[PDB]
Design an enzyme around this catalytic site. Structure first.
Site, PDB file in Angstrom:
ATOM      1  N   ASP A 125      34.792 -21.923  19.737  1.00 24.87           N
ATOM      2  CA  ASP A 125      34.913 -21.593  18.322  1.00 24.87           C
ATOM      3  C   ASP A 125      35.946 -22.511  17.685  1.00 24.87           C
ATOM      4  O   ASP A 125      36.808 -22.070  16.924  1.00 24.87           O
ATOM      5  CB  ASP A 125      35.320 -20.130  18.141  1.00 24.87           C
ATOM      6  CG  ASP A 125      35.304 -19.694  16.688  1.00 24.87           C
ATOM      7  OD1 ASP A 125      34.494 -20.241  15.910  1.00 24.87           O
ATOM      8  OD2 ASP A 125      36.100 -18.803  16.323  1.00 24.87           O
ATOM      9  N   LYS A 127      36.315 -24.403  15.243  1.00 27.73           N
ATOM     10  CA  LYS A 127      36.008 -24.791  13.870  1.00 27.73           C
ATOM     11  C   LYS A 127      37.287 -25.089  13.091  1.00 27.73           C
ATOM     12  O   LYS A 127      38.359 -24.597  13.440  1.00 27.73           O
ATOM     13  CB  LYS A 127      35.197 -23.698  13.168  1.00 27.73           C
ATOM     14  CG  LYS A 127      35.892 -22.353  13.089  1.00 27.73           C
ATOM     15  CD  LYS A 127      34.992 -21.307  12.456  1.00 27.73           C
ATOM     16  CE  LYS A 127      35.655 -19.942  12.435  1.00 27.73           C
ATOM     17  NZ  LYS A 127      34.790 -18.916  11.793  1.00 27.73           N
ATOM     18  N   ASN A 130      40.246 -22.840  12.240  1.00 24.01           N
ATOM     19  CA  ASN A 130      41.083 -22.396  13.351  1.00 24.01           C
ATOM     20  C   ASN A 130      42.050 -23.472  13.836  1.00 24.01           C
ATOM     21  O   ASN A 130      42.561 -23.398  14.952  1.00 24.01           O
ATOM     22  CB  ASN A 130      40.214 -21.924  14.518  1.00 24.01           C
ATOM     23  CG  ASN A 130      39.621 -20.548  14.283  1.00 24.01           C
ATOM     24  OD1 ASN A 130      40.221 -19.708  13.614  1.00 24.01           O
ATOM     25  ND2 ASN A 130      38.439 -20.310  14.839  1.00 24.01           N
ATOM     26  N   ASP A 147      43.328 -18.687  17.235  1.00 25.35           N
ATOM     27  CA  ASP A 147      42.199 -17.779  17.392  1.00 25.35           C
ATOM     28  C   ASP A 147      41.359 -18.113  18.620  1.00 25.35           C
ATOM     29  O   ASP A 147      40.352 -18.812  18.523  1.00 25.35           O
ATOM     30  CB  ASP A 147      41.320 -17.797  16.141  1.00 25.35           C
ATOM     31  CG  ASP A 147      40.192 -16.787  16.207  1.00 25.35           C
ATOM     32  OD1 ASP A 147      40.321 -15.797  16.960  1.00 25.35           O
ATOM     33  OD2 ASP A 147      39.178 -16.978  15.503  1.00 25.35           O
ATOM     34  N   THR A 167      35.243 -26.488  43.494  1.00 28.47           N
ATOM     35  CA  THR A 167      33.946 -25.824  43.453  1.00 28.47           C
ATOM     36  C   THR A 167      33.576 -25.297  44.837  1.00 28.47           C
ATOM     37  O   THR A 167      32.468 -24.805  45.048  1.00 28.47           O
ATOM     38  CB  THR A 167      32.843 -26.786  42.972  1.00 28.47           C
ATOM     39  OG1 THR A 167      33.330 -27.567  41.873  1.00 28.47           O
ATOM     40  CG2 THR A 167      31.604 -26.013  42.535  1.00 28.47           C
TER      41      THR A 167
END
Ligand SMILES: *[C@@H](c1ccc2[nH]nc(-c3cc(OC)c(OC)c(OC)c3)c2c1)[C@@H](C#N)C(=O)NC(C)(C)CO
Length: 300
Positions: A125, A127, A130, A147, A167
């Site tokens: 997120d 964006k 933020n 955020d 891994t």
């Protein structure tokens, strides 16, 4: 333990979400103001987010956690307040913003994401709204990514946190696969940020009144004007970077690390210092910007 209101004085709001809320508060004892996020536990589990804020919140360019509370019902996350507003908007409102400063800002932001991805964390997120300035100092040292309500730690099956290197433990491919996407997905967002800073407008959106379909249609086309008008005076080096960040195929899209090795970021001292030729429509961009992420999050 104790309680939040005992040490903080709530003030006006900053951003009201469906699940969480952010308000300005003041530490009574010190009179130093901060930002407190109130999350409704009954609607959302704020564990993941806080765990990330506790561990990586120490990063200079990551909003820092200063205190926490929990009266059973809600959870109060006392973080640092941002007295610099949105990073993008502020920059878009600098008529003489050079091309060198773009490399500077993007570098600082990128350096931060590289660390996160390296630790097996994805913002999911990232964006423009933020990414704020902690103060009005202007210097990139005051940049903060905020955020993390959609962040995600790469872990195994047995609740074991993992890193993109180790891994040898059990990590489901489909879970590892989406991480490979979310990583490049964060990059994509940075591509948008860059694109907007250089020109002064969104690459796939025109305004707040753009149908989600046409926006996605554009994103889906892969191609996007990287020349003409406002791009005329932009370096080909800069344009090269953008095209690889907004690369339609995430597999062929640059990674945070690769972006940092790019000459536009490496050889920044060879970038222009004169003003850019951009569009002066900060608010319009804000709508077009929101108009985009909204279309992407329509299934979230
Ligand atoms: C709320 C939040 C949390 C911590 C913050 N620290 N500073 C600010 C802040 C943001 C602003 O918006 C650009 C702003 O400008 C008006 C100011 O004032 C100068 C301060 C904070 C804001 C978010 C978080 N976390 C938040 O609400 N997140 C959602 C929407 C609930 C989604 O997670």
């Amino acid at each position: 333990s104790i309680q939040f209101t005992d040490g903080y004085e709530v003030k006006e709001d900053i951003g009201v979400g469906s699940y969480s809320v952010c308000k300005r508060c003041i530490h009574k004892a010190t009179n130093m103001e901060f930002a407190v996020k109130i999350i409704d536990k009954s609607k959302r589990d704020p564990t993941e987010e806080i765990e990330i804020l506790l561990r990586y919140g120490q990063h200079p360019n990551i909003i820092t956690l200063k205190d926490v509370y929990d009266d059973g019902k809600y959870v109060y996350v006392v973080m640092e307040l941002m007295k610099g507003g949105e990073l993008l908007d502020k920059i878009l409102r600098q008529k003489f913003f050079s091309e060198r400063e773009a490399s500077a800002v993007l570098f600082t932001i990128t350096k931060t994401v590289e660390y996160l991805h390296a630790q097996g964390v994805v913002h999911r997120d990232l964006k423009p709204s933020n990414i704020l300035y902690v103060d009005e100092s202007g210097n990139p040292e005051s940049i903060r990514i905020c955020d993390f309500g959609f962040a995600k730690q790469l872990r195994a099956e047995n609740g074991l946190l993992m890193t993109p290197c180790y891994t040898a433990n059990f990590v489901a491919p489909e879970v590892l696969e989406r991480q490979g996407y979310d990583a490049a997905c964060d990059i994509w967002s940075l591509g948008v940020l860059l694109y907007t800073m250089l020109t002064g407008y969104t690459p796939f959106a025109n305004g707040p009144d753009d149908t989600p379909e046409e926006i996605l249609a554009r994103i889906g086309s892969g191609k996007f004007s990287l020349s003409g008008g406002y791009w005329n005076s932009v370096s080909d080096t800069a344009k090269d970077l953008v095209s690889k960040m907004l690369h339609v195929d995430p597999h062929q899209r640059l990674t945070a690390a690769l972006v940092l090795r790019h000459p536009w970021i490496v050889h920044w001292d060879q970038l222009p210092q004169y003003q850019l030729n951009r569009q002066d429509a900060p608010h319009l961009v804000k709508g077009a910007m929101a108009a985009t992420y909204s279309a992407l999050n329509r299934n979230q």
